Design a protein around this nucleic acid. Structure first.
Ligand SMILES: *[C@@H]1O[C@H](CO)[C@@H](O[C@@H]2O[C@H](CO)[C@@H](O)[C@H](O)[C@H]2NC(C)=O)[C@H](O)[C@H]1NC(C)=O
Ligand SMILES: *[C@@H]1O[C@H](CO)[C@@H](O[C@@H]2O[C@H](CO)[C@@H](O)[C@H](O)[C@H]2NC(C)=O)[C@H](O)[C@H]1NC(C)=O
Ligand SMILES: *[C@@H]1O[C@H](CO)[C@@H](O[C@@H]2O[C@H](CO)[C@@H](O)[C@H](O)[C@H]2NC(C)=O)[C@H](O)[C@H]1NC(C)=O
Ligand SMILES: *[C@@H]1O[C@H](CO)[C@@H](O[C@@H]2O[C@H](CO)[C@@H](O)[C@H](O)[C@H]2NC(C)=O)[C@H](O)[C@H]1NC(C)=O
Ligand SMILES: CCCCc1nc2c(N)nc3ccccc3c2n1Cc1ccc(CN)cc1
Ligand SMILES: CCCCc1nc2c(N)nc3ccccc3c2n1Cc1ccc(CN)cc1
Ligand SMILES: *[C@@H]1O[C@H](CO)[C@@H](O)[C@H](O)[C@H]1NC(C)=O
Ligand SMILES: *[C@@H]1O[C@H](CO)[C@@H](O)[C@H](O)[C@H]1NC(C)=O
Ligand SMILES: *[C@@H]1O[C@H](CO)[C@@H](O)[C@H](O)[C@H]1NC(C)=O
Ligand SMILES: *[C@@H]1O[C@H](CO)[C@@H](O)[C@H](O)[C@H]1NC(C)=O
Ligand SMILES: *[C@@H]1O[C@H](CO)[C@@H](O)[C@H](O)[C@H]1NC(C)=O
Ligand SMILES: *[C@@H]1O[C@H](CO)[C@@H](O)[C@H](O)[C@H]1NC(C)=O
Ligand SMILES: *[C@@H]1O[C@H](CO)[C@@H](O)[C@H](O)[C@H]1NC(C)=O
Ligand SMILES: *[C@@H]1O[C@H](CO)[C@@H](O)[C@H](O)[C@H]1NC(C)=O
Ligand SMILES: *[C@@H]1O[C@H](CO)[C@@H](O)[C@H](O)[C@H]1NC(C)=O
Ligand SMILES: *[C@@H]1O[C@H](CO)[C@@H](O)[C@H](O)[C@H]1NC(C)=O
Ligand SMILES: *[C@@H]1O[C@H](CO)[C@@H](O)[C@H](O)[C@H]1NC(C)=O
Lengths: 773, 774
RNA sequence: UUG
RNA sequence: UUG
């Protein structure tokens, strides 16, 4: 179907609308720029390779390159792989870029460069040099960058990539860059705000440096500035998970009261981890546009109960005061100044790490009339006592976050404590409505009154509490509109089949990782509790170690998805015991069933007949299946996806069309298949996806793989097999080289293991002409 | 060093004292009895193979055979592998055994036999026919067994191996087996006690059958009987995890009051799952020797509060009354009859599954003066309330088990609900510290010192798997002055205070594994230097805590010898560039054993080995995804004896292991990616004793890598499951493997050529390389 | 392989 | 692969 096989080890893509030819060679173990890159190439990406140098030969004929991404071909030692350390810094020979007349973006990050590469074309808008060893900026080296708009220089001098001196920037180095909009000098051992900066700046990133003081006029001309990040100068170092040096004398980052006067356009101000003890209202006298203010990780515990500066912030959307607690202090309660009530525009308020024992309704009163308040985050506060009914006054919020507290009767898991949460790399129930997140607390017992006045709730997260209780349907009575209950990581005791039946609008129920009572013999479990839940769509009961059930069927008219992974259906379906072979049969509208990780080394006859009639996607992954009667797939008349990955199957069916006329997606990766049957895919016409990767296949012949089926395949995975590239393989090699069908990893892992001559050689590159002499 | 390589695929052992030549061919994928079995073979085992028949050729030369274990060469379908189903039942041709004049033991279990094999020699003492399809016993077929003493016929007709009829035994079938001592007819669809049985019986196993009634004279002559098991006739089927049919009308197994009158020798009586509602004292009128009585899984809840029969059992050692609760009943308390006080010899009392809300001191008063009482088991009772101080009257006990209850302010996990807990297979803890109070798997969320008032005698406390989500500050355990072992695993400990546990001043072992909760949230203070206070602490387990951060930078101990730190994130604590935690273990001065496997250590930052404490001898870095390893750094570990690097991603071994560690004795490199050894790998490694190179990708081994003065010290050398290339370049290695005394497991099974073509799949032990010397 |  |  192709006249000329593509042999280039890079994905090539055409976006003809913007006349972009995109050539992506990311992570192809390349030691040279491959020959044959299309001459019309616009975007060329060579990240994560081991190309030791650039030269005029590199892009010689690539004259229409608008973007070169050449990052991480020599990552600095501590940042890169220790099993493949780069031996010598990337070498850029003169004239490597002067010919690239159309070049708009050049990425050279993580190449251990010692200096700003010169000879760059005047068309260049974006230059990126992060994670090199460039720690002295001189005006002379920047003249070439007249038209530059975006310049990334950070991570060139910090604990993970040290330069062992202070960063140096010459007076007015950036001033004649008259179009420069974004300047990032983060994570760099900088000691003062460089001046003067061009007044065209929109974004200035100076965080994680050694700037001890702000001069009044450091930001005098920056009347177009919209984002300023000064975080991590004089860091608060308590429990820092990276090496952290505080400013001497317990000093804060000193900012004169008028320092921001010119920043009339400022939208985002980040002062995280500057050891601040006070927030002078004078800072904000001439910024009324401010929308986002990060004051997390300072020492503003007292200031939170005063906070006059808030009166100057009527347009603020986001306010973060997390982790301002005083060391060794466990406050009784939360003192929020009344000044908070003047935050007319506030949608998002975050005060984790305030650290206090009792949350009481009136302490939140300053928030009562903030009409736009969508998120209230009081997590990681070690709150012991909170009458949940106080949130009757917060029905308008989208998320009330009390996660990780000690209550009893989405941000990344490392977020407030990571060094650079915006660092670049070399390469949930909120949607249901009002969410009360109580996850990771100490709730041991629940009763209906605990949820008094909270009938508006759509999602309740009780995951990771200590609830060890037989629910009989009486515990959630107020939660009349609840659509989503996360009850995972508790110790539910399904003694009563009336559990959860009061949650009459419940659509999704997670009772995963409630294995405690299931792992002790002789205890009653009612798995038919689903019959009462008339609108239940999705039920998760993963990792419960279920090996026994008092009831023999689960029943639902509504349930479409059942996750039953990590249980012991091998015990329930012990050969000879027929009692549970229709456990799922009366889930009449069930479409998706996950019974991976159930130790099902075989499937007793009757399991398939016992499946409910509308099953579409069935996972049997990770079972150690050593055999499989493919013919029994005939019972699964609506089966579209069959996941058999990570098992021990050695054969495929003689005729897949004779096993299922509906099957579209067959995942057989990570098995032990050594050969295909003679007529495997014969007449399997709307088969569309076939994963045979990570098996031990040596040969594939045309009878097993007729082209009338292969041409309909959205994707066909064959990588990591044991292909023998002898003359018997002539059809398969020819087809792989000329096919339109998508086959991932042809450049990297579709390989001959022999015969000797061809060992380790890619099938895409293989020349079998000697077979036709 | 051997003139004749051993090529037989079976382990051979000589026990010269007992004149035994033991040949074990268990699980060798054999389709025929291997040739070359020693002619002096006494014990021959061929279990788990697929030898389709036996014939006079089978044991032709093996005339001194005392034991043949030929089990599971054709296991019944539901019992066997579903990937390798046996196609046809084992065929035994005539006179296959009649020549084995010394044959004392014959096992033919799991072969789908239809009949009792004939022609057996009269020397036979033990015949085993479990898991076949023999379900009709006729006196004629038993004449050959004149001298038989032990006869196993069970598991021939039950749900996993059905015969679809009742078991049949001809009247007096066994009577003329005048030496018969043990008779097992369990799991067989038997409907009556076969009679008459020979009076020589010592053990009678009739459990899991369909016997609804015992005739009064069923055991009339069994005056030597010591063990009688009638369990599982009229079973109690509630929550049974196997198919279970009760006797109609909820009837119990009916036993006449005089049924046991002849059993004056009875030591063990098992009436488990017989749906009993009463235990008539008349049963035990002439059994005064009884030591073990299992009455679990009946309906004896009422009877436990009356239990007059206990007055007839002064010699009883074990009494099991577990799982007698009435269905749907949650009693307020445990009513134990005063009759319990007459169990003067009782060592072990088990009453799980009574099901009651409140345990109070006086309810155990019938037990107070049982002087020999060692074990009191009240687990799986859903007890909600118990003043632990009541056990101050029980300091003589060895184990007090309140496991799996709901208390708040060693048996197999499947045991009482298992079908046949003594079922044979085809192939074949802190109690030692002193008084143990097991509170594991309860609902304890908060502990305070007074909870343990009056229990200073305790040596071990098991709090595993509670809900304790508390900052221990040294005040919670104050009465436990003699505690040697605290299992605090699977809780939510909050190590805010470095004074946690410091009140346990005699503590030798502390398990705080799987307390990951507070370690999983950023910015929380964790004091790992809490160890300084524990002056006699030997062993610390803190596995699977997900530790990725620590406020303190060193742990300190003068006493700690073993630290388990597996399943944490030392990769994060030792991030390249961060030096603060590189001496985390350095001041554990007496530490000899460190497990830091499963810590995602894909590389080791420089400074880790220098930072190890000076006496470390046993170090595990297993299961880290280690992709590289500077072997030279082992030089810092001057007392290292065992290095476990299994299940990693290493591709090379050091050029000279002796130049890396002068102390290393045990080097575990199994399950890595090693493709070749260095030229002089083991040169002068005089302290090497154990070397596991199995499950790698080695193609070739040359003599320079494996000097013979090092190999001769090796207690063991593992090489199986590599990718050995059996060309003429491999002549040294093939010759050496064939002629070496060194122990190398799996030469018959998994030391194999992958090529060249001709030799693919062949064992190197069997490989003939003469063409390389023409 | 810029966490 | 007798649980
Ligand atoms: C291909 O490269 C071009 C050139 O850098 C990328 O286009 C730029 O995208 C950013 C995104 O906002 C714009 O600000 C620039 O102005 C764009 N430049 C041009 C010339 O249009 C494009 O995103 C890249 N695409 C791919 C798939 O790599
Ligand atoms: C950041 O710059 C400081 C200089 O202010 C570096 O500190 C010097 O480091 C050298 C070598 O380690 C010492 O000999 C000097 O005494 C240090 N000077 C001072 C004033 O401390 C520091 O190492 C740099 N940090 C990084 C990560 O590059
Ligand atoms: C070898 O076979 C003999 C005979 O079958 C075994 O001897 C029996 O051992 C059991 C258990 O150890 C004793 O209780 C019996 O009294 C012995 N029976 C006879 C008839 O002597 C012996 O154990 C076997 N040894 C090995 C290593 O397989
Ligand atoms: C145990 O024996 C009973 C009866 O002795 C068998 O039950 C009969 O089974 C046949 C075939 O399945 C049925 O048609 C009869 O109705 C049953 N009879 C009675 C009285 O129940 C039973 O199959 C046997 N069990 C096993 C495991 O072999
Ligand atoms: C964001 C807080 C980091 C420090 C910290 N860690 C913990 C912890 N692991 N457990 C606690 C348990 C209860 C109260 C406070 C803390 C606490 N705290 C706060 C705290 C620590 C110590 C003290 C002195 N009692 C008061 C408050
Ligand atoms: C060995 C016990 C098997 C049956 C069982 N299962 C459970 C269970 N999952 N949770 C309980 C929780 C409290 C009390 C009893 C049970 C119980 N029980 C006993 C029981 C169940 C139900 C009732 C009536 N509420 C009384 C007693
Ligand atoms: C909690 O507050 C609600 C009103 O918001 C009140 O009805 C209820 O009684 C309170 N409960 C407790 C224990 O204070
Ligand atoms: C509930 O909270 C936990 C955090 O502990 C989170 O992992 C989970 O995704 C949440 N559930 C939903 C439905 O968002
Ligand atoms: C369910 O249990 C709750 C809590 O103990 C109790 O208030 C209620 O009476 C019970 N409901 C039913 C229907 O048994
Ligand atoms: C669940 O099934 C059990 C069968 O053991 C029965 O006792 C109970 O009534 C059933 N309940 C529901 C809600 O289906
Ligand atoms: C205990 O139960 C027995 C038998 O049911 C009865 O005779 C006795 O009076 C009961 N005693 C107590 C204290 O409950
Ligand atoms: C528990 O019993 C002991 C007597 O052994 C007594 O000292 C203590 O007060 C009791 N505690 C409670 C809570 O009943
Ligand atoms: C404590 O009990 C747990 C839970 O039953 C058990 O796994 C553990 O091995 C016990 N610990 C000791 C030291 O015996
Ligand atoms: C430790 O905590 C316990 C329980 O909260 C308390 O009784 C005691 O005063 C505390 N002791 C110290 C030394 O902090
Ligand atoms: C443990 O180390 C911390 C240092 O962060 C110190 O504050 C504390 O007092 C130490 N405690 C002990 C018992 O060494
Ligand atoms: C080394 O320690 C491991 C546990 O970490 C133990 O299993 C092994 O037997 C020990 N080896 C020696 C030789 O002491
Ligand atoms: C390693 O070998 C070299 C050369 O034999 C020797 O100089 C050096 O001292 C040795 N080091 C150790 C630790 O044995």
């Amino acid at each position: 179907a192709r006249w000329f096989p593509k042999t280039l080890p890079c994905d090539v893509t055409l976006d003809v609308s913007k006349n972009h030819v995109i050539v992506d060679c990311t992570d192809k173990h390349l030691t040279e720029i491959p020959g044959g890159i299309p001459t019309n190439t616009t975007n060329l990406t060579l990240t994560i390779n081991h190309i030791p140098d650039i030269s005029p030969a590199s892009f010689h004929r690539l004259v229409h390159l608008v973007e070169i991404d050449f990052r991480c071909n020599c990552v600095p030692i501590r940042l890169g792989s220790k099993s493949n350390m780069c031996p010598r810094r990337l070498q850029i020979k003169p004239r490597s870029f002067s010919g690239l007349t159309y070049l708009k973006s050049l990425y050279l990050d993580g190449n251990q460069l010692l200096e700003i590469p010169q000879g760059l074309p005047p068309s260049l808008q974006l230059l990126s040099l992060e994670a090199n060893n460039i720690f002295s900026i001189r005006k002379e080296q920047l003249t070439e960058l007249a038209n530059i708009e975006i310049l990334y220089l950070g991570q060139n001098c910090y604990y993970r990539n040290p330069c062992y001196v202070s960063y140096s920037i010459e007076k007015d180095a950036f001033l004649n860059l008259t179009k420069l909009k974004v300047l990032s000098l983060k994570d760099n051992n900088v000691t003062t705000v460089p001046t003067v900066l061009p007044s065209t700046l929109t974004e200035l990133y100076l965080y994680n440096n050694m700037i001890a003081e702000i001069q009044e006029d450091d930001f005098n001309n920056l009347n177009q500035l919209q984002i300023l990040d000064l975080s991590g100068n004089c860091p608060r170092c308590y429990n820092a998970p990276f090496p952290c040096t505080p400013c001497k004398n317990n000093s804060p980052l000193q900012i004169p009261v008028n320092a921001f006067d010119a920043l009339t356009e400022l939208k985002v101000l980040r002062l995280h981890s500057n050891s601040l003890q006070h927030v002078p209202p004078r800072w904000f006298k001439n910024i009324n546009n401010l929308q986002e203010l990060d004051l997390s990780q300072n020492f503003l515990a007292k200031e939170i109960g005063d906070a006059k500066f808030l009166h100057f912030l009527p347009n603020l959307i986001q306010l973060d005061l997390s982790f301002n607690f005083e060391l060794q202090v466990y406050r009784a309660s939360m003192n929020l100044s009344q000044a908070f009530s003047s935050l007319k525009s506030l949608k998002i308020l975050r005060i984790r790490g305030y650290v206090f024992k009792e949350l009481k309704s009136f302490q939140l009163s300053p928030l009562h009339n903030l009409q736009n308040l969508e998120v209230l985050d009081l997590g990681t506060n070690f709150i012991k006592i909170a009458n949940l009914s106080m949130f009757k006054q917060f029905k308008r919020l989208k998320v009330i976050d009390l996660s990780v507290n000690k209550i009893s009767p989405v941000l990344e898991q490392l977020y407030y404590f990571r060094y650079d949460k915006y660092a670049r790399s070399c390469r949930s129930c909120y949607k249901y409505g009002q969410t009360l997140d109580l996850s990771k607390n100490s709730i041991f017992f629940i009763k209906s009154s605990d949820f008094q006045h909270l009938s508006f709730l759509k999602c309740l997260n009780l995951s990771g509490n200590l609830i060890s209780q037989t629910l009989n349907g009486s515990e959630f009575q107020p939660l009349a509109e609840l659509r989503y209950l996360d009850f995972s990581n508790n110790r539910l005791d399904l003694l009563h089949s009336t559990a959860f039946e009061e949650l009459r609008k419940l659509e999704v129920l997670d009772i995963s990782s409630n294995s405690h009572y299931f792992q002790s013999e002789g205890i009653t479990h009612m798995l038919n509790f689903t019959k009462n839940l008339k609108v239940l769509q999705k039920l998760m009961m993963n990792d419960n170690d279920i090996s026994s059930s008092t009831s023999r069927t689960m029943e639902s008219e509504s349930l479409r998805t059942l996750e039953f992974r990590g249980n012991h259906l091998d015990v329930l379906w012990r050969d000879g015991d027929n009692r549970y072979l229709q456990l799922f049969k009366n889930l009449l509208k069930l479409e998706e069933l996950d019974i991976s990780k159930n130790s099902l080394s075989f499937l007793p006859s009757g399991v398939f007949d016992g499946m409910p009639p509308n099953l579409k996607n069935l996972s049997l992954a990770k079972n150690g299946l050593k055999s499989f009667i493919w013919e029994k797939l005939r019972y699964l008349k609506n089966l579209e996806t069959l996941d058999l990955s990570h098992n021990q199957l050695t054969t495929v069916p003689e005729r897949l069309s004779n096993c299922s006329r509906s099957l579209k997606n067959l995942i057989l990766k990570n098995n032990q298949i050594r050969s295909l049957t003679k007529y495997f895919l014969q007449d399997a016409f709307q088969l569309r996806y076939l994963d045979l990767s990570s098996n031990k296949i040596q040969m594939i012949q045309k009878t097993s793989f007729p082209e009338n089926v292969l041409n309909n395949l959205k994707m066909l995975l064959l990588h990591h097999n044991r292909f023998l590239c002898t003359c018997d393989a002539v059809w398969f090699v020819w087809w792989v080289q000329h096919t339109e069908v998508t086959i991932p990893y042809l450049a990297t892992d579709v390989t001959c293991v022999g015969p000797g001559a061809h060992k380790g050689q890619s099938v895409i590159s293989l020349d079998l002409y000697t077979c036709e002499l």
